[PDB]
Ligand binder design. Structure first.
Ligand code: HEM
Length: 153
């Protein structure tokens, strides 16, 4: 359970993201795909992209980055009271998209890196720890839904 002070640190940096949701989503997906190429393989939509320049030039990738970060922002702004938002996401990622929990760890690392690059003055260690806790809570709660459905592994 995050404290109120931890949530404030999380949402204070997240308010900085929402000024350029699409730029952040591009940086985060690109980092994810470069760092963990098995992730790119889960998107039939993106698997033709073979270079970082092609990734940066894809408008469809930029659109998906906004989809991802819009859903994550709505979950973070619930400060843990996020059951209604996670249900459908856990269900589609477990049963349709077939995304292992481990890849949610990977995208959490990319999010943290990109926030540190773009917002260092609002993403010192206290805020990095709080955002780590928030993303761990996200993963923990998705993992319990996966386990229900037979996908925790
Ligand atoms: C912060 C974590 C993530 C969030 C908030 C998120 C959110 C979403 C949303 C809102 C959609 C569209 C609606 C739906 O299908 O449920 C989507 C689709 C999808 N996601 Fe995620 N996602 C996350 C992580 C991942 C990761 C790590 C992968 C793969 C490695 C992934 C793979 C996919 C795929 C394959 C689709 C369908 C894309 C398409 O072909 O249109 N997601 N995601």
């Amino acid at each position: 359970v995050l404290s109120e002070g931890e949530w404030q640190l999380v949402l204070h940096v997240w308010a900085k993201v929402e000024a350029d949701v699409a730029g952040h989503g591009q940086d985060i997906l690109i980092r994810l795909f470069k760092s963990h190429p098995e992730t790119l393989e889960k998107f039939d939509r993106f698997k033709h992209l073979k270079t970082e320049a092609e990734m940066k030039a894809s408008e469809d990738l930029k659109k998906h980055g906004v989809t991802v970060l819009t859903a994550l922002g709505a979950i973070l702004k619930k400060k843990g009271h996020h059951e209604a938002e996670l249900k459908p996401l856990a269900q589609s990622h477990a049963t349709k998209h077939k995304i292992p929990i481990k890849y949610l760890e990977f995208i959490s690392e990319a999010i943290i890196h990109v926030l540190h690059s773009r917002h260092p003055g609002d993403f010192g260690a206290d805020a990095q720890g709080a955002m780590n806790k928030a993303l761990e809570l996200f993963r923990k709660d998705i993992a319990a839904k996966y386990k229900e459905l037979g996908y925790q592994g």
